[PDB]
Amino acid sequence: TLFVALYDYEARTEDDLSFHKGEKFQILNSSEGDWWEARSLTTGETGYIPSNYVAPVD
Ligand code: NA
């Protein structure tokens, strides 16, 4: 399942990933907690994203 961003997010460190509303991601690890390692389908950039900022694509 792909996920889509609900809101803009600005990373605080190197480890999380900034993204814009509507960006889509493939998820890499989601059982480490509620922050998921993801890859932007737009930029291929990877980083942790807050899972409460995304939803599964329709
Ligand atoms: Na979510």
C-alpha of residue 42 to centroid of ligand 1, in Å: 19
Six-digit token string for 13: 């460190």
What is the experimental method?
X-ray
Map tokens 């493939």 to a residue: 26
What residues pair up with 47 in beta bridges, in sequence order? 38
- Cβ-contact 48, 16 below 8 angstroms: yes
C-alpha of residue 19 to centroid of ligand 1, in Å: 15
Separation in Å, CA 51 to CA 23, 25, 31: 13, 11, 11
Gap between the Cα atoms of 3 and 12, Å rounded: 21
Resolution to 1 decimal place, in Å = 1.5
Gap between the Cα atoms of 46 and 12, Å rounded: 14
- Cβ-contact 36, 49 below 8 angstroms: yes
C-alpha of residue 51 to centroid of ligand 1, in Å: 5
Following DSSP, what letter does each residue of 1-58 receive, concatenated?
--EEESS-B--SSSSB--B-TT-EEEEEE-SSSSEEEEEETTT--EEEEEGGGEEE--
C-alpha of residue 29 to centroid of ligand 1, in Å: 14
